[PDB]
């Protein structure tokens, strides 16, 4: 959830196939 | 010069709802026991009840700053009555000329707030000057504050004596 890892984490969570994990990282981003 | 009988007369006049005479005889009773207020009036004479009755006498006569001053005479200063009376604007006493007899800094803080709230800037500056006396500083030694209170007490009571008799 780092400023330089916010997009990367939310993109890896999107690519993992979890439809709910992206929403958690979206708030942090 | 029997102060007990003077207090009885004052109480009679108070129950009959004639408060100028009641204040007259209460001040006479206080004057007897203190050589015209040159000494402190004994607590057994000016009890909290007698002081409350003089406060009600002053309120009913629309002498509201005198109510504020007399509220300081109690063992526990009655801010409720003092603040309620200072809010009044039909005062029949000298008002700002009586602020010299206030030694409580809380009463003067209220007076400053009240005059600022009403744009009465001259009286506000009088109250602020009254607060700014080093004699009245609340963190002074207790003997200095007691003496300040006592001399203001004597001066106020002699002024009331001249006013009422």
């Amino acid at each position: 959830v780092l400023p330089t890892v916010l997009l990367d984490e939310i993109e890896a969570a999107e690519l993992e196939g979890n439809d709910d994990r992206i929403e958690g990282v979206l708030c942090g981003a | 010069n029997n102060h007990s009988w003077l207090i009885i007369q004052a109480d009679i006049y108070f129950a009959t709802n004639q408060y100028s005479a009641a204040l007259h005889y209460y001040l006479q009773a206080g004057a007897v026991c203190s050589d015209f207020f040159n000494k402190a009036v004994p607590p057994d004479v000016y009890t909290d009840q007698v002081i409350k009755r003089m406060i009600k006498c002053c309120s009913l006569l629309n002498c509201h700053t005198q109510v504020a001053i007399l509220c300081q005479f109690l063992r526990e200063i009655d801010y409720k009555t003092a603040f309620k009376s200072l809010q009044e604007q039909n005062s029949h006493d000298a008002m700002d000329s009586y602020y010299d007899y206030i030694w409580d800094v809380t009463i003067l803080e209220y007076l400053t707030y009240l005059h600022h709230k009403r744009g009465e800037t001259d009286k506000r500056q009088i109250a602020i000057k009254a607060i700014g006396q080093t004699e009245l500083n609340a963190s002074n030694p207790e003997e200095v504050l007691q003496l300040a209170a006592q001399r203001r007490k004597k001066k106020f009571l002699q002024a009331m004596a001249k006013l009422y008799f």
Partner: protein, 561 residues
Amino acid sequence: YFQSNMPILLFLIDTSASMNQRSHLGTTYLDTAKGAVETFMKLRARDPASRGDRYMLVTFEEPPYAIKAGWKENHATFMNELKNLQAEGLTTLGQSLRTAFDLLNLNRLVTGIDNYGQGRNPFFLEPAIIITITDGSKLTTTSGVQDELHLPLNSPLPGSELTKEPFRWDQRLFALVLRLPGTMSVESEQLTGVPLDDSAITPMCEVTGGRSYSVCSPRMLNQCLESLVQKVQSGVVINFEKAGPDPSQPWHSCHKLIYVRPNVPIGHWPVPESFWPDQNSPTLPPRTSHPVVKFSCTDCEPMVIDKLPFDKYELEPSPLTQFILERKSPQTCWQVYVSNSAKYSELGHPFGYLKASTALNCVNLFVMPYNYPVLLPLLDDLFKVHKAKPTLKWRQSFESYLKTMPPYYLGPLKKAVRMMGAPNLIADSMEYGLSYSVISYLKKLSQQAKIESDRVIGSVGKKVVQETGIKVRSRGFQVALLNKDLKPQTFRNAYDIPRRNLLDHLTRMRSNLLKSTRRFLKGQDEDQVHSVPIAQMGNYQEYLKQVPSPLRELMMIDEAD
């Protein structure tokens, strides 16, 4: 992510009329307070870290005018507002303290720094201290005198119910109570410590993790200001409590501060919540602003694995630190608990420990994962036995640990195990701490907080006119009063000319009108000009710019070099 390197210095200057009392210095209490703020900043400026300090000013006035310098108000505005404070109101200490804390907590819900329902993050901090300068005079309202300090609850902030106190984790309240007498005190200038004040502000100060200062001498004033400058630290106040029997004392309960060191503070593990999360709760339980942290004086072993991310927070000096450094056991640690953080256990599982440093100079809190004595052996065996290739028994034990593991730790645990080198250890799923209703409520609170922050920040300018009137009684119409903005344009308005000055000023305006041939047609000379503010009176650096440049050719201050 969060800037803890820009501390907020909120000054709650008492502007009640009781601050017009005069000291032996000949200055008022308010003058002493303004000088105290100026001295505080002069002392603070010696520290190179003082850059980026946010200075704020709140007073005892009503909320529209209480805030003089809030967010997005520059230093010059702060100085101008401080210089012009006037003590003309009532001692509304509780209301002004409430407004000050609301100002501090204005943007907390917008930026999610509180991390509600998702664990308490010591690195999610916006460190502020409120230095309230006042006297010991009794609290007042229009009705009467308040013998005790009570913060009002009316007009609650959106989301204020989520924390059951107005003050927050990273906020401390310090009181500078001026007891300077009007007479030159005969006491010598003793080098003793500053006394705690006995006014109604001292309990609130102590509860917040700060303290009150009683001042009755300029030397004492300097001493308190120096100690206050030393107390500007980035950290969060922890309510440390003792659990179990001894191994009614000062070190049994303490509202100490743990330091958080940036570089942008970095941390992984949150402090546990005081409740077990569930997905069917419509509402989130309220939070204590200082988490009740319980330690067991058992002297356990401080187990650590090599690659784990562990957060270390240095405790400030306190009787608990004195006790730990006096027993002299730097190789052992006291396990640390949060009550009701577990599914069933009242005391809950440990999440960290107090371990004294090697030199026995400081005590540090080591924030571990939840129920770390069970997780850490398993986490070590993951990389030592099968090299992040989990077995059936290990996965079963890990899941069993997960049953006691609160969902708000899932994100930090996922990040930790990922940076060890086992990204695929757990299901990549959203944390189950919060219900949909709770998250929707949180987002609604964020929007409401954004709107309220926008309104409050735009309201600090005091863009209003005082009621310049005398309400005339019958036994509507009012009598006006002089204002600051009605500068007399005596040339442009004939009503501003006094009778005694009528003829000469008539001559002056006549000359100004007719003799303007190849001259200047300005307003009134000697008023619009030569009545400049004193700050701009001798600004020669700015003045020289408006003049054409010349031709090139090749004790502190006295208005120039």
